[PDB]
């Protein structure tokens, strides 16, 4: 019996300060070796009902600290049907996506929780959580 597996790997030496759009902060993976037509990944931190791939994270030390990121990857499309997250149509057992800075930002020193959930086309195997640390 095959299970859908997820992993999430975060970069490591991030400096608080000016951050450019496109800077990769984390990479995610989804795995499912059963029969499927694609993968869907979304997050509860999605910014607004009209931005399926854009997330807004709040700081642990100060919730007023925000960082805005987007889900990205070759082949991933915004899920316009559900309006939540990104969709990739593939029979491949493995898929991967990036979480990147969305818009030039002044990121303060704090820690942010990055959560995402994945579906093969949620239990404790379909979701993952990491902390993103920006230091001064």
Residue numbers in the entry: 30 to 150, 164 to 178
Sentences from the paper on this structure:
In order to obtain soluble SafD, we engineered a self-complemented SafD-dsc, in which the N-terminal extension of SafA (i.e. the G strand) is fused with the C-terminus of SafD via an artificial DNKQ linker. The final model was refined to 2.2 Å resolution using program PHENIX.REFINE. The SafD-dsc structure reveals a classic immunoglobulin-like fold, in which A-G strands form a β-sandwich fold with two β sheets packed against each other. Using Dali server, SafD is predicted to belong to the Afa/Dr poly-adhesin subfamily containing DraD (r.m.s.d. of 1.5 Å for 134 Cα atoms), HdaB (1.6 Å for 143 Cα atoms), AfaD (2.5 Å for 142 Cα atoms), AafB (1.1 Å for 129 Cα atoms) and AggB (1.5 Å for 133 Cα atoms). Interestingly, SafD-dsc structure harbors one highly negative charged patch that could constitute the binding site of the unknown host receptor. Similar to the published SafA-ANte structure, the P1-P5 residues (i.e. Gln9, Lys11, Val13, Ile15 and Phe17) of donor G strand interacts directly with the hydrophobic groove in SafD. In SafD-dsc, a conserved Leu4 in SafANte was used to mimic Phe3, and the corresponding hydrophobic pocket is termed the P** pocket. The asymmetric unit (ASU) contains two SafD-dsc molecules. MD simulation of in PapD-PapGII complex suggested a regulatory role of LoopA-B. Based on these observations, it is reasonable to speculate that the Try13 sidechain of SafD might act as a molecular ‘switch’, regulating the access of incoming Nte peptide.
The saf operon is located on Salmonella enterica centisome seven genomic island, which consists of four contiguous genes encoding the major subunit (SafA), periplasmic chaperone (SafB), outer membrane usher (SafC) and minor subunit (SafD).
